[PDB]
Amino acid sequence: KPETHINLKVSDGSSEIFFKIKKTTPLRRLMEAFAKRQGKEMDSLRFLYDGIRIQADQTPEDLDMEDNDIIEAHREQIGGGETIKFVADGDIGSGSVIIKPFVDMEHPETSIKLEMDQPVDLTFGAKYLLDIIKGSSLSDRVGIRLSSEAPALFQFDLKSGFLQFFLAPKFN
Amino acid sequence: MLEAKFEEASLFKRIIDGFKDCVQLVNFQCKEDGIIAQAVDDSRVLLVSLEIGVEAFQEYRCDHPVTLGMDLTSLSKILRCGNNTDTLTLIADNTPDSIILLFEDTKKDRIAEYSLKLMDIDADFLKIEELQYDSTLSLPSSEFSKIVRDLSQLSDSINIMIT
């Protein structure tokens, strides 16, 4: 049969706990478990997997979870909750797409994952981005890593290999 | 000699197309364990890093480290050659002045062989350094493509904001 069990960290950054559970168990155990240890109450806490607010009634095969995946615990928010916003302001007007991390389990090649450690706010040159997307031909998905200090990484994966683009952000 | 054979001629074409648009002359370095390429564009704001492991060729062999410098325009003219379903094989004998691209169709029927004169190209100096990043997201490349293409209409600058 398949794996039938997987391990997941659960962290708030100073305190983490690992668990192994069937891929069919509601996460309530782990969320109550982490919560008891924390002193804090079960529902005084916001829980997200890769940017996605999850709720105790949900299973790992639902979120299409990997081995070694992480759930993060935050104090109650706004909210319900992280987002990516792309914006351009030009001469003629302006544009603004907001996308939310989500996982569709029926077909998950489509989903949107987000490890945010620090929030970032960066600008790039659309001429360069326009060439970078020419690698969409190589890969179903694109991986983007953003550093407020280093150039950004845009990665397209092949079967044993990759095409990477490192692009310096603008200043002003 | 170097001898690297792709299952799909389409793969290599599709990889060159991935970046023939920002850098134009690139040195491909062949090794015992695969091929890599780095190049910076002219503005020197964009670095392109290619790596193809051994598990992407159906058959890979590289006796000695060799470096082939290619004009990516020249190269993609030749990559428009044959059926793009076909077995494409690169071949260079060591200390090379040309590279050979050899298309063959499954049946012994046709066999197109191209030779490309090589370039002399300076290595620049860049090395890369990974460092962790504040944020990491992954999404469909078709979606990101649409976003960029669309917002491209309005400004010369796109800004990303995660919170």
Side-chain angles (χ1 to χ4, degrees):
Chain A
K1 293 179 179 179
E3 295 302 320
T4 82
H5 298 275
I6 53 155
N7 306 266
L8 322 153
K9 195 197 307 184
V10 169
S11 181
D12 67 31
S14 60
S15 167
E16 41 184 23
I17 296 177
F18 306 81
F19 296 80
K20 133 171 293 88
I21 54 171
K22 12 299 141 112
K23 297 183 206 287
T24 328
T25 314
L27 303 168
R28 196 177 299 84
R29 321 173 154 188
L30 293 52
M31 311 186 55
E32 286 165 339
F34 183 80
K36 180 154 168 70
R37 174 60 187 174
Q38 281 327 121
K40 297 163 65 186
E41 35 218 326
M42 217 312 210
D43 306 77
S44 78
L45 273 169
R46 190 168 111 94
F47 283 78
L48 46 90
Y49 161 58
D50 281 5
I52 309 177
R53 179 188 208 106
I54 38 108
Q55 10 105 3
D57 242 269
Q58 228 166 357
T59 84
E61 114 242 62
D62 276 358
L63 306 157
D64 198 29
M65 267 164 146
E66 271 299 87
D67 212 39
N68 297 324
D69 268 346
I70 316 186
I71 281 97
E72 286 173 359
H74 303 277
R75 322 105 300 203
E76 208 59 50
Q77 287 308 316
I78 314 90
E82 291 157 12
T83 51
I84 311 80
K85 195 169 92 304
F86 311 83
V87 178
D89 291 306
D91 282 344
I92 85 160
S94 70
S96 199
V97 192
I98 281 170
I99 87 191
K100 292 178 304 306
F102 88 93
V103 176
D104 187 56
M105 78 202 73
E106 303 153 326
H107 15 66
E109 58 300 307
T110 207
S111 90
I112 297 174
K113 304 283 180 146
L114 170 71
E115 149 212 309
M116 175 182 61
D117 291 349
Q118 304 286 22
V120 273
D121 177 288
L122 309 136
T123 305
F124 299 95
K127 75 153 107 155
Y128 299 103
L129 293 173
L130 273 176
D131 302 337
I132 293 170
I133 57 167
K134 296 248 181 66
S136 286
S137 57
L138 293 184
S139 183
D140 267 358
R141 297 181 67 85
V142 70
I144 305 181
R145 331 239 310 164
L146 294 180
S147 189
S148 64
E149 308 309 358
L153 198 222
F154 300 90
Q155 188 169 305
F156 299 92
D157 281 358
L158 342 155
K159 299 294 180 289
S160 204
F162 56 61
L163 186 62
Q164 276 165 344
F165 298 84
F166 295 88
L167 180 62
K170 266 189 159 82
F171 303 81
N172 280 325
Chain B
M1 298 236 319
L2 157 68
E3 211 194 71
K5 171 161 182 192
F6 290 90
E7 178 128 16
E8 297 278 85
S10 64
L11 178 45
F12 191 37
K13 192 186 112 44
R14 179 170 286 118
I15 274 177
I16 297 304
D17 286 347
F19 70 111
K20 91 242 244 280
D21 279 335
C22 16
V23 220
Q24 200 229 315
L25 343 192
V26 24
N27 287 314
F28 294 91
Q29 288 155 250
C30 313
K31 299 297 178 251
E32 276 82 346
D33 63 343
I35 296 175
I36 67 110
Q38 272 109 46
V40 171
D41 71 313
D42 304 320
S43 323
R44 307 268 136 38
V45 272
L46 177 83
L47 173 66
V48 182
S49 171
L50 170 68
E51 175 191 303
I52 325 160
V54 149
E55 341 229 7
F57 312 79
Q58 89 147 350
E59 222 243 51
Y60 187 72
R61 170 170 75 66
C62 199
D63 296 347
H64 297 94
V66 61
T67 280
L68 25 263
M70 320 251 233
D71 188 317
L72 285 196
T73 296
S74 293
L75 174 71
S76 44
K77 319 254 305 315
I78 291 169
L79 254 9
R80 289 205 284 269
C81 279
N83 308 151
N84 116 129
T85 74
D86 271 31
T87 105
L88 173 60
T89 313
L90 319 184
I91 305 187
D93 59 48
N94 292 102
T95 86
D97 292 40
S98 264
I99 185 197
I100 290 182
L101 306 94
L102 179 44
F103 299 85
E104 86 181 353
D105 179 70
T106 30
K107 161 64 181 172
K108 72 196 208 61
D109 41 34
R110 81 103 201 237
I111 21 142
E113 138 172 342
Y114 301 88
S115 140
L116 189 61
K117 294 174 164 65
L118 289 187
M119 302 280 269
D120 284 339
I121 306 183
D122 304 285
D124 218 89
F125 299 80
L126 48 91
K127 179 59 163 60
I128 85 87
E129 317 242 336
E130 44 193 286
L131 177 63
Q132 285 110 358
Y133 299 80
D134 300 345
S135 282
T136 308
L137 68 154
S138 75
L139 71 162
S141 56
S142 74
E143 181 153 1
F144 176 62
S145 186
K146 174 73 170 197
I147 287 173
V148 178
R149 268 183 298 101
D150 288 353
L151 295 171
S152 267
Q153 308 279 44
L154 299 85
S155 192
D156 265 31
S157 313
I158 299 192
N159 165 282
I160 333 257
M161 192 170 330
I162 301 145
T163 39

